[PDB]
Amino acid sequence: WKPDEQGLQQILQLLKESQSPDTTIQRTVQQKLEQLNQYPDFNNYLIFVLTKLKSEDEPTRSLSGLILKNNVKAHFQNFPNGVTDFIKSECLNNIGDSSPLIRATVGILITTIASKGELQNWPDLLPKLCSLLDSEDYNTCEGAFGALQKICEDSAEILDSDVLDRPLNIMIPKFLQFFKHSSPKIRSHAVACVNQFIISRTQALMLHIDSFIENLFALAGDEEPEVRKNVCRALVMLLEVRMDRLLPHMHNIVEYMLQRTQDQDENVALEACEFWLTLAEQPICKDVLVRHLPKLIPVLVNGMKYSDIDIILLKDDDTISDWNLRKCSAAALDVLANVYRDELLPHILPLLKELLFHHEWVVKESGILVLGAIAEGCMQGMIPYLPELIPHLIQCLSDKKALVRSITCWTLSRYAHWVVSQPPDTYLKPLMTELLKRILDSNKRVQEAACSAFATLEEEACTELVPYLAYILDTLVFAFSKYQHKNLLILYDAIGTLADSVGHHLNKPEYIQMLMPPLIQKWNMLKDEDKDLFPLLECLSSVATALQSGFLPYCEPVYQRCVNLVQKTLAQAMLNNAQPDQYEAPDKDFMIVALDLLSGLAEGLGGNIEQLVARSNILTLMYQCMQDKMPEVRQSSFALLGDLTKACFQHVKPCIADFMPILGTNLNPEFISVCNNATWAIGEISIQMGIEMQPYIPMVLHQLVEIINRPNTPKTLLENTAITIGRLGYVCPQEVAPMLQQFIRPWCTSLRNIRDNEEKDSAFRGICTMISVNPSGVIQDFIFFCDAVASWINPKDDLRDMFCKILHGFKNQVGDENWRRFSDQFPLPLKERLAAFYGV
């Protein structure tokens, strides 16, 4: 292939035209480029310029390759074999071009053809590059190593599988040799290349571990930053993977690493710091580090100050980096605090005193952070200093620098549990007061901090907020008019938790007047594709639950949208199941919460829900959800079932014929929560169906008896199983009763521990009925029945009579003689219970 004279001038002009320093004129030409991208012959002209037309300036030639790259980035299959083969050959022959810019251009070109046009479609790429490493020209050798590094970074695991032969087995040992190269840049590429294969534990490397670690040490003290960075990086990774071989040198390592953590070069430091985080998460840390703590701690703490940049970059969505020296240091400190517990205080506490009361706010702020970082692990040791620290921090909330207010919000929240364990007036009251003001701070970052802190505080305080409800709500509902979006999400969480914490104490007319309007208002701002959907749901669900019946005027749009979401999800699930590559599998979590919020409205609204239930296909969907592959969906729906049974059985009855079957198959004890809710639904239906339960009784009853007698089964499942057993026997004694002998022993040992409530009364009514039908099935193990009856403190009058009849009838049926002997087994409290309660 050869370029055409005028064809060349076409492109050379086109390029000359995209040099333009004018947005208007430049973007006009970039247009026809796309029409030529079809013409795959165009790419031959494109590469020719870069690599052959040396009578042209570097900027232009570079641009040619930089454009060709993009024709690869989108639509590269469009390339003919003869074209790619030409680019590949031209690239490899110029890899180490005399010019620096061209070399980089050629480089990024190879890189891209390798990843996008996958590795096996370039069979002899690697061995040619490997060979090129040995080239005597530094530029070609370095250029090759550059490319090889990027390959290793891009497609490490591909090179680490048979999908391309086993090319690393030659590469790794070859790289390891270049560790002793005379150029600092080359040494860097070599270690960077290898580092790609530590965690993947690739054999080519792991079987040369000692060889590797050795050159790693040889390079520890290299003056060139990038080499040191990589060495650190290597050692950090080695920690997770080959600790065995690193152990014998551990002390020399931490010594190096400590020195590195304070390196002048930002990057080396942060790489070293990672070491402390990683180390701290190993079981051997406690022993290996102890003697270094005195030097470790101060370095961490010192690293925990905001950098001068960090300061300016603050005093949008997260303006600071996701991860830096400070966050890493604190990360480590936090972890170490959980490792050493109170044993860390000797090294930190002297530092705190000096930091927390400092005139330079940058220093003070880092103090407050430390205080918060160490909170989880060193809690017990901190207790004695809290009576003076907590008030100090409350005072700090009023600091003039916003960045001090914000961490103070955080640090305080980290001690919430102790704060609520004190007399309310002393710490809780003033904290909560000051925290509320902070919520309305004029600085976005502080608002974020303060609202989160308060969310945390509410979880700890619960009913201790009840007296302050009106004051809380005021500032919370006002925040709606101030909070942008990032914070608005935290506000939802603060409101959700509030309701969760105060429970029914929120159910008061004037509170509802404040809260629901701006919530409902934001509910109508939504789409089923809105990012705010899920947080606002969970918020509204917590609120519904607390508000109980009081939620009535607000529930129609919430109810509606939830039933919608369930349909949306089941529909997309169907279409995916049919044609997976064509329709994306839906996110089931929305359905789960929707189901839950429905179960929530059913509990809160009881009777009044019936209207909304009637005018929707909730039960149809419910039916599908009960057959979902994912247990969480089945679990959530069985809860909704029982909830609907209880609330408005009239709309449910038509479906009982279909539900029961599915419920029957879902009695699987392995899926604990599904099994729990299935059981609970059964009992709830039996009560409703009444004597009509008869047909459905024998198809669940066998598994329930197998479950109740099954060992190693959660307390709560057994209890709920026993409750259903009893409940069936109440409405349909004839079917259930004749199995009394089998389930009586565990039934008693289960329910005797549960509080005298409706569920218990319900169940014992069932057991008493079943006895007056099959007295034979209980007389064996009557001692257990006595015990379960002794457990009652406040039985209903009638049930108390039922206990007598049984207790008496099966006493004088064995005589006063045998009874007295039978009564010897009872403890004083029990023997005296039945003696007092039922006339012995």
Q: In sequence order, what are the residues at sequence separation of 6 or more whose Cβ sits closer than 8 angstroms to the Cβ of residue 594?
A: 537, 562, 563, 565, 566, 569
Residue 680 and residue 724 in contact, taking contact as beta carbons nearer than 8 Å: yes
Distance CA 140, CA 653 (A): 81
Annotated resolution, angstroms = 3.0
Please tell me the distance from the alpha carbon of residue 622 to that of residue 566, in angstroms, as a whole number. Answer: 9
Number of domains, the chain: 1
Spatial contact of 213 and 253, defined as CB atoms under 8 Å apart = no
Distant-in-sequence, close-in-space partners of 308: CB < 8 Å, separation ≥ 6: none
Place of tokens 């409101």: 495
- DSSP assignment of 534-586 equals HHHHHHHHHHHHHHGGGGGGGHHHHHHHHHHHHHHHHHHHHHHHH-TTTSPPP
Question: Which residue, 619, 647, 629, 716, is CA-closest to 675?
Answer: 716
Distance CA 767, CA 723 (A): 10
- CA 169 from centre of chain: 38
Instruction: Report whether 730 contacts 690 (CB < 8 A).
Output: no
Q: Rounded to whole angstroms, how far apart are CA atoms 4 and 8?
A: 6
Which residue, 670, 663, 628, 624, is CA-closest to 645?
663
Torsion of CA 415, 418, 419, 425, to 10 degrees: -170
Three-class SS state of 528: coil
For residues 500 and 250, give the distance between their C-alpha atoms in angstroms, rounded to a whole number.
49
Instruction: Please give the full DSSP string across 749-796, using - where no structure is assigned.
Output: HHHTTS-SSHHHHHHHHHHHHHHTT-THHHHTTHHHHHHHHHT-SS--
Which domain CATH number covers 280?
1.25.10.10
Please classify residue 596 by burial: count the beta carbons closer than 10 Å to its beta carbon, then call 0-12 exposed, 13-18 middle and 19+ buried: buried
- What are residue 222's DSSP bridge partners? none
CA–CA gap between residue 809 and residue 801 (Å, rounded): 12
Q: What is the DSSP letter of 220?
A: T
How many other C-beta atoms lie within 10 A of the C-beta of residue 312? 9
Residue with tokens 């013409």: 39
Instruction: Tell me if 293 sits within 8 A of 347, measured CB to CB.
Output: yes
Q: Which residues pair with 163 in a beta bridge?
A: 165
Report how far residue 718's alpha carbon sits from residue 627's, in angstroms, rounded to the nearest whole number: 24
**CB–CB of 729/767 below 8 Å?**
yes
To 5 degrees, how large is the angle CA 27–CA 14–CA 47?
A: 115
Q: List the structure tokens of 218.
A: 């040889």
Task: Of 764, 770, 762, give the one whose Cα is nearest residue 741.
Answer: 770
CA distance 679 to 416: 39
How far apart are the C-alpha atoms of 608 and 322, rounded to whole Å? 49
Q: What is the DSSP letter of 712?
A: S
Half-sphere exposure of 823 (CA within 13 A, CB side): 22
188 CB contacts (<8 Å, ≥6 apart)?
224, 226, 227, 230
Question: Residue 717 CA to chain centroid, in angstroms?
Answer: 27
Beta strands in 177-226 (DSSP E): none
Q: How far apart are CA 385 and CA 374, in angstroms?
A: 13
- Tokens describing residue 543: 């609120």
Residues 6+ apart with CB under 8 A from 11: 42, 45, 46, 49, 64
CA-wise closest residue to 655 among 691, 626, 697: 626
Contact 168, 202 (CB under 8 A): yes
Cα(192)–Cα(83) distance, integer angstroms: 32
**C-alpha span between 836 and 831 (Å, rounded):** 9
Coil, helix or strand at residue 224? coil
Strand partners, 165: 163
The candidate with the shortest Cα–Cα distance to 262, out of 329, 185, 195, is 329
Q: Is residue 583 a contact partner of residue 544, using CB atoms and an 8 Å limit?
A: no
Say if CB 700 and CB 664 are below 8 A apart. Answer: yes
3-state secondary structure of 320: coil
Smallest CA-to-CA distance from 167 within 185, 137, 134, 193 is with 193
Q: After which residues is the chain broken (C to N over 2.5 A)?
A: 315
Residue 706: both structure tokens together: 């197998």
Q: Looking at residue 163, what DSSP letter applies? A: B
How far apart are alpha carbons 114 and 12 in whole angstroms?
Answer: 27
Residue in the block written with tokens 């005021």: 474
- Contacts (Cβ under 8 Å, ≥6 apart) of 89: none
Taking 3-state DSSP, the helix, strand and coil percentages for the chain, each rounded to the nearest 5, stand at 75, 0, 25
Which residues have CB under 8 Å from 818's CB, separation 6+? none
Q: How is residue 383 annotated by DSSP?
A: G
Element (H, E) at 101: helix 100-115
CA-wise closest residue to 603 among 697, 717, 680: 680
In whole angstroms, give the CA distance from residue 471 to residue 436.
Answer: 9
Three-class DSSP category at 105: helix
Q: What is the secondary structure of 247-314 as a DSSP string? A: GGGHHHHHHHHHHHHT-SSHHHHHHHHHHHHHHHTSTTHHHHHTTTHHHHHHHHHHHTSPPHHHHHTT
Distance from C-alpha of 195 to C-alpha of 239, rounded to nearest angstrom: 13
The length of the chain is 840
**Contact between residue 301 and residue 348 where contact means Cβ atoms under 8 Å apart:** yes
Structure tokens at 325: 């020296």
Which tokens is 233 given?
């990086």
Q: Quick one: tokens of 94?
A: 């110029």
φ, ψ of residue 165 in degrees (nearest 5): 80, -165
Residue among 642, 720, 730 at smallest CA distance from 693: 730
- The amino acid sitting at 471 is Y
**CA 558/CA 594 separation, integer angstroms:** 9
In 279-429, DSSP assigns E strands to: none
Say which residue the tokens 């079981």 belong to.
Answer: 283
Q: Are 608 and 549 in contact (CB under 8 A)?
A: yes
Task: Pull the structure tokens for residue 470.
Answer: 């009106």
**Residue type at 604?**
G
d(CA 341, CA 421): 21
- The experimental technique behind this entry is X-ray
Q: How far apart are the first and last CA of the chain?
A: 111
Residue indicated by tokens 């069932």 = 766
What's the rounded Cα separation, in Å, for the pair 452 and 448? 6
**CA dist., res. 819 & res. 831, Å (int):** 12
Ramachandran area for residue 583 (φ above 0: left; ψ -120 to 50: alpha; else beta) = beta
Beta carbons within 8 Å of 612's beta carbon, 6+ residues apart: 555, 556, 559, 601
Two tokens at 616?
Answer: 């929707």
- CB-CB contact of 550 with 507 (8 Å): yes
The CA R_g of the chain, rounded to the nearest whole Å, is: 36
Q: Are 597 and 558 in contact (CB under 8 A)?
A: yes
Q: How far apart are CA 543 and CA 505, in angstroms?
A: 11
- Domain with 440, as residue range(s), is 1-840
